[PDB]
Design an enzyme around this catalytic site. Structure first.
Site, mmCIF file in Angstrom:
data_model
loop_
_atom_site.group_PDB
_atom_site.id
_atom_site.type_symbol
_atom_site.label_atom_id
_atom_site.label_comp_id
_atom_site.label_asym_id
_atom_site.label_seq_id
_atom_site.Cartn_x
_atom_site.Cartn_y
_atom_site.Cartn_z
ATOM 1 N N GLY A 138 22.772 69.363 -24.471
ATOM 2 C CA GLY A 138 21.606 69.775 -23.562
ATOM 3 C C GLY A 138 21.787 69.725 -22.254
ATOM 4 O O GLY A 138 21.409 70.931 -21.607
ATOM 5 N N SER A 162 11.733 77.981 -20.414
ATOM 6 C CA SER A 162 10.271 77.712 -20.976
ATOM 7 C C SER A 162 10.739 76.829 -21.957
ATOM 8 O O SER A 162 9.859 75.764 -21.668
ATOM 9 C CB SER A 162 9.418 79.029 -21.653
ATOM 10 N N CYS A 163 11.563 76.881 -22.823
ATOM 11 C CA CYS A 163 11.972 75.886 -23.792
ATOM 12 C C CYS A 163 13.183 75.473 -23.932
ATOM 13 O O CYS A 163 14.044 76.499 -23.815
ATOM 14 C CB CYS A 163 11.135 76.054 -25.123
ATOM 15 N N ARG A 187 22.554 64.086 -27.698
ATOM 16 C CA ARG A 187 23.253 63.037 -26.804
ATOM 17 C C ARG A 187 24.778 63.246 -26.801
ATOM 18 O O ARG A 187 25.631 62.050 -26.918
ATOM 19 C CB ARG A 187 23.030 61.508 -27.662
ATOM 20 N N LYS A 188 25.242 64.285 -26.890
ATOM 21 C CA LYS A 188 26.599 64.584 -27.002
ATOM 22 C C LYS A 188 27.077 65.589 -25.684
ATOM 23 O O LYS A 188 28.181 66.036 -25.460
ATOM 24 C CB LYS A 188 27.050 65.423 -28.137
ATOM 25 N N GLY A 189 25.849 66.055 -24.867
ATOM 26 C CA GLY A 189 26.045 66.829 -23.628
ATOM 27 C C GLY A 189 25.894 68.375 -23.883
ATOM 28 O O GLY A 189 25.843 69.063 -23.015
ATOM 29 N N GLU A 194 10.160 75.116 -16.790
ATOM 30 C CA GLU A 194 8.546 75.131 -16.973
ATOM 31 C C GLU A 194 7.993 73.774 -17.163
ATOM 32 O O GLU A 194 8.493 73.188 -17.801
ATOM 33 C CB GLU A 194 8.312 76.047 -18.365
HETATM 34 C C1 LIG Z 1 11.609 72.546 -20.288
HETATM 35 C C2 LIG Z 1 10.803 72.012 -21.349
HETATM 36 O O1 LIG Z 1 10.178 72.704 -21.981
HETATM 37 S S1 LIG Z 1 10.941 70.190 -21.720
HETATM 38 C C3 LIG Z 1 11.167 70.101 -23.431
HETATM 39 C C4 LIG Z 1 12.364 69.575 -23.751
HETATM 40 N N1 LIG Z 1 12.828 69.433 -25.191
HETATM 41 C C5 LIG Z 1 12.342 68.694 -25.907
HETATM 42 O O2 LIG Z 1 11.637 67.678 -25.877
HETATM 43 C C6 LIG Z 1 12.786 68.919 -27.552
HETATM 44 C C7 LIG Z 1 13.407 67.662 -27.935
HETATM 45 N N2 LIG Z 1 14.524 67.069 -27.335
HETATM 46 C C8 LIG Z 1 15.657 67.569 -27.160
HETATM 47 O O3 LIG Z 1 15.737 68.683 -27.789
HETATM 48 C C9 LIG Z 1 16.545 66.930 -26.102
HETATM 49 O O4 LIG Z 1 16.269 65.459 -26.103
HETATM 50 C C10 LIG Z 1 17.048 67.659 -25.044
HETATM 51 C C11 LIG Z 1 17.324 69.091 -24.888
HETATM 52 C C12 LIG Z 1 15.824 67.510 -24.086
HETATM 53 C C13 LIG Z 1 18.156 66.884 -24.264
HETATM 54 O O5 LIG Z 1 19.302 67.177 -25.331
HETATM 55 P P1 LIG Z 1 20.746 66.459 -25.609
HETATM 56 O O6 LIG Z 1 21.704 67.197 -26.261
HETATM 57 O O7 LIG Z 1 20.222 64.981 -25.856
HETATM 58 O O8 LIG Z 1 21.210 66.202 -23.863
HETATM 59 P P2 LIG Z 1 22.467 65.426 -23.399
HETATM 60 O O9 LIG Z 1 23.277 64.716 -24.214
HETATM 61 O O10 LIG Z 1 23.072 66.463 -22.166
HETATM 62 O O11 LIG Z 1 21.468 64.490 -22.570
HETATM 63 C C14 LIG Z 1 20.995 64.586 -21.363
HETATM 64 C C15 LIG Z 1 20.426 63.335 -20.695
HETATM 65 O O12 LIG Z 1 19.412 62.674 -21.728
HETATM 66 C C16 LIG Z 1 19.494 61.467 -21.997
HETATM 67 N N3 LIG Z 1 18.964 61.553 -23.339
HETATM 68 C C17 LIG Z 1 19.101 62.021 -24.355
HETATM 69 N N4 LIG Z 1 18.399 61.756 -25.420
HETATM 70 C C18 LIG Z 1 17.621 60.517 -24.943
HETATM 71 C C19 LIG Z 1 16.834 59.576 -25.525
HETATM 72 N N5 LIG Z 1 16.366 59.640 -26.914
HETATM 73 N N6 LIG Z 1 16.028 58.907 -24.962
HETATM 74 C C20 LIG Z 1 16.547 58.589 -23.666
HETATM 75 N N7 LIG Z 1 17.233 59.518 -23.032
HETATM 76 C C21 LIG Z 1 17.972 60.475 -23.858
HETATM 77 C C22 LIG Z 1 21.176 61.337 -22.176
HETATM 78 O O13 LIG Z 1 21.494 59.959 -22.173
HETATM 79 C C23 LIG Z 1 21.518 62.055 -20.864
HETATM 80 O O14 LIG Z 1 21.124 61.152 -19.839
HETATM 81 P P3 LIG Z 1 22.445 60.377 -18.950
HETATM 82 O O15 LIG Z 1 23.456 61.414 -18.696
HETATM 83 O O16 LIG Z 1 21.882 59.671 -17.972
HETATM 84 O O17 LIG Z 1 22.636 59.454 -19.984
#
Ligand SMILES: CC(=O)SCCNC(=O)CCNC(=O)[C@H](O)C(C)(C)COP(=O)(O)OP(=O)(O)OC[C@H]1O[C@@H](n2cnc3c(N)ncnc32)[C@H](O)[C@@H]1OP(=O)(O)O
Ligand SMILES: [Zn+2]
Length: 254
Positions: free
Chosen positions: A153, A139-140, A149-151, A174
């Site tokens: 997520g 869901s979230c 941005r370290k993997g 979701e």
């Molecule tokens: C299912 C739902 O409910 S949707 C709600 C999603 N959550 C949120 O919006 C809360 C705020 N955001 C976050 O917590 C995080 O940005 C997450 C959880 C979405 C991703 O977490 P991260 O630890 O940054 O993930 P990770 O390092 O594995 O990156 C995944 C991809 O997203 C990209 N990414 C991460 N941050 C950003 C950013 N600020 N802008 C653009 N792209 C981004 C990465 O570059 C990567 O893409 P790539 O492999 O093409 O480079």
């Protein structure tokens, strides 16, 4: 805007959105959270007095995954309600919309930690509805800014599909997705599909992977592969090898 900054362990974290912390904390520019129980306090000295009586060094739940310095705790919103409410309030500081913070009972919370000699440090989490007719396997999802941005997520998303695969089901996040959610999942699904093709039907792909047919189909469409694009597969495989945080299914105790 309210609050604007939090202190969370060794970290100063700038918030992205307001969160409905109970009145008198809703009107404070800075909050001090205990990093292990997620309790909010209004000053450093109050936090310091709390760290002296709080005995937690990790989430109040069973550890269902551990590999090297990374753990996943499975927290039940029906059992550790306060903690899960505190976690939802924290999460809302980085979400534009969340469901109201005090209905946590319907969810399980999969809490990601990076561990050292000072304890198991919260990195992020995904929540998951216990009973869900839409078959949403998340869901979230939220990774704390200082770890973004370290993997981490991708690891959590990967971990969400491992649970799906182990429940014998395909799952999907979701919707609506946030923009950051959309980029993360798209990035995950492309890499899973490209890597699988490198190492190898949509229904078969769905079974091996736990990614649902819809998301495979639309990812394949996005890649204009809906049909192997060899150049794209090879280049991605070169991009990879150029994932230090990675799910090992044998480390799951679930
Ligand atoms: C299912 C739902 O409910 S949707 C709600 C999603 N959550 C949120 O919006 C809360 C705020 N955001 C976050 O917590 C995080 O940005 C997450 C959880 C979405 C991703 O977490 P991260 O630890 O940054 O993930 P990770 O390092 O594995 O990156 C995944 C991809 O997203 C990209 N990414 C991460 N941050 C950003 C950013 N600020 N802008 C653009 N792209 C981004 C990465 O570059 C990567 O893409 P790539 O492999 O093409 O480079
Ligand atoms: Zn505490």
């Amino acid at each position: 805007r309210c609050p604007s900054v939090i202190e969370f362990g060794k970290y100063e974290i700038h918030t992205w959105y307001s969160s409905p912390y109970p009145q008198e904390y809703s009107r404070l520019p800075k909050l001090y959270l205990c990093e292990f129980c997620l309790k909010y306090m209004k000053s450093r000295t109050i936090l310091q007095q709390h760290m002296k009586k709080c005995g937690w060094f990790h989430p109040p739940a069973n550890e269902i995954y551990r590999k090297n310095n990374i753990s996943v705790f499975e927290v039940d919103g029906n059992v550790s309600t306060i903690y899960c409410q505190n976690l939802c309030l924290l999460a809302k500081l980085f979400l534009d919309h969340k469901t109201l913070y005090y209905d946590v009972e319907p969810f399980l919370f999969y809490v990601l930690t990076q561990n050292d000699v000072k304890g198991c440090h919260l990195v992020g989490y995904f929540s998951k509805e216990k009973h869900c007719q839409q078959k949403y396997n998340v869901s979230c999802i939220m990774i704390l800014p200082q770890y973004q941005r370290k993997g981490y997520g991708r690891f959590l998303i990967d971990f969400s599909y491992l649970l799906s695969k182990r429940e014998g089901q395909a799952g999907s996040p979701e919707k609506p997705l946030s923009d950051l959610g959309r980029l993360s999942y798209m990035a995950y699904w492309k890499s899973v599909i490209l890597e699988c093709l490198y190492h190898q039907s949509i229904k078969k792909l769905s079974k091996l992977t736990g990614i649902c047919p819809q998301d495979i189909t639309s990812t394949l469409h996005h890649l204009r592969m809906l049909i192997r694009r060899e150049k794209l597969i090879q280049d991605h495989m070169a991009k990879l090898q150029l994932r230090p945080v990675d799910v090992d299914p044998e480390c799951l105790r679930w």
